[PDB]
């Protein structure tokens, strides 16, 4: 009818219908937070615009935009401040395109044990799309970045209902901002950005968690110091260690901002309790990382006692979902299926889930029980 239950405690959610969107999993209404049903990820490598997940922090989201009047301001430690129209971006600068995953820092938080506070998401706070726009490098070079620059800040049209609440503003290092891959995207899957995905312009930060991907982006500031805004200084912090993790119940001793994705993979064509025919069972799914390249996906039908190599689909780019397929002989009875990806720098997925106070960065080997008959 109109609700679903996610597979964790207090998992009931309304199915909600927004303009331009198919029915999605409603987390919050004001501001909107919308999760993608898992089944969508079995429909193809690129997430359709009408299915793409939505995450916002502040209730004052823009609800009327005049695209002709819209301006992107570039200011701070630059030789020439710029005020750029959408027409300017499309006409005066080379276009670039990238197929890239956007995934929220807190994707899968609902599965973290012990449970932690925050957005109680299943795995649907991620999506893959073909972004087109201008490399930020090109716009910054036009402004003329000055020696001594350290960071670039990014702010959008949304704001707090109460002005004392800190504005949503994020920062990137200057070397990252000018790397050529960070993009001012005006197009998503060949169309103008859906409204809730940041119409008319957003930052795309390939291989970095979604918090950086500032939507409705209208203000870019080059600064000669580290940005100390709340959403960099206090929010979006991970343990400053290799595992980005702590002992359950324990605060980190030091933290750093969240940054690149860790390696993830999913089986998309089966879910818990699915029936399959005993014999050769066809499996398929996706894998992704921070852009180093998926080297392999191993698949198991006996809870990781033994692994079979999956065949990797032809790729769409190092920042995209990477498809994979495997055919496994399954004897009659119950089987715990797992998949596990590794990337070209040797990052992989832990067999046992780790923990951090914020519930960011989950990437445990996913297990799915099926019934072969």
């Amino acid at each position: 009818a109109d609700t679903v239950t996610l597979p964790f405690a207090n998992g009931e959610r309304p199915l909600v219908m927004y303009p331009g969107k198919r029915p999605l999993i409603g987390l919050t209404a004001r501001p909107p937070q919308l999760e993608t049903p898992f089944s969508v990820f079995d429909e193809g490598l690129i997430t359709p615009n009408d299915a793409f997940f939505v995450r916002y922090h502040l209730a004052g989201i823009p609800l009327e935009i005049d695209p002709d009047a819209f301006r992107l301001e570039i200011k701070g430690k630059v030789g020439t401040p710029l005020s750029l129209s959408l027409q300017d971006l499309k006409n005066d600068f080379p276009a670039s395109e990238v197929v890239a995953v956007n995934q929220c820092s807190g994707n899968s938080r609902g599965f973290v044990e012990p449970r932690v506070g925050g957005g109680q998401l299943a795995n649907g706070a991620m999506g893959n799309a073909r972004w087109r726009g201008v490399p930020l490098k090109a716009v910054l070079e036009k402004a003329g970045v000055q020696a001594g620059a350290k960071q670039v800040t990014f702010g959008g049209l949304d704001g707090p209902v109460i002005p004392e609440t800190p504005d949503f503003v994020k920062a990137l290092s200057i070397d990252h901002a000018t790397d050529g891959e960070v993009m001012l995207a005006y197009s998503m899957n060949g169309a103008d950005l859906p409204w809730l995905n940041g119409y008319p312009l957003r930052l795309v930060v390939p291989g970095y968690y979604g918090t950086y991907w500032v939507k409705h982006l209208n203000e870019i500031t080059v600064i000669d110091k580290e940005f100390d805004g709340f959403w960099m200084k206090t929010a979006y912090r991970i343990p400053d260690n290799a595992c980005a993790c702590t002992e359950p119940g324990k605060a980190p001793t030091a933290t750093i901002p969240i940054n690149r994705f860790d390696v993830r993979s999913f089986i998309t064509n089966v879910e818990n309790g699915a029936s399959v025919k005993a014999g050769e069972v066809p499996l398929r799914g996706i894998a992704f990382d921070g852009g180093y390249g998926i080297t392999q996906v191993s698949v198991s039908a006996d809870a990781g006692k033994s692994w079979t190599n999956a065949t990797l689909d032809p790729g769409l780019g190092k920042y995209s979902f990477r498809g994979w397929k495997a055919v496994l002989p399954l004897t009659k009875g119950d089987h715990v299926l797992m998949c596990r990806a590794t990337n070209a720098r040797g990052e992989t997925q832990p067999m046992q889930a780790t923990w951090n106070p914020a519930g960011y960065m989950r990437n445990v080997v996913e297990a799915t029980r099926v019934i072969a008959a």
Partner: protein, 81 residues
């Protein structure tokens, strides 16, 4: 003309309780965001979790909530959710 976007109606509500914190939460906890933020938190988290949530809203986000109301709200939440 500009382009515009229409949101569906908000319907999220707090779980009624006889504790006075129910009305104080209705009066203080929907000013910035819908109460589905609260309704969807992990269940039976208890007193320390909800004490911390309320204090964060006040200290970090500047929710204008006085001390008596803050305790009423956290107590109602810990007992109800």
């Amino acid at each position: 003309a500009p382009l515009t976007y229409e949101l569906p109606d908000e319907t999220a509500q707090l779980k009624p309780a006889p504790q006075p914190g129910f009305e104080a939460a209705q009066n203080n906890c929907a000013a910035c965001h819908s109460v589905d933020y609260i309704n969807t938190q992990p269940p039976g988290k208890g007193q320390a979790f909800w004490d911390a949530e309320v204090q964060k809203m006040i200290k970090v986000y500047h929710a204008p909530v006085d001390e008596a109301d803050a305790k009423a709200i956290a107590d109602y939440l810990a007992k109800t959710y």
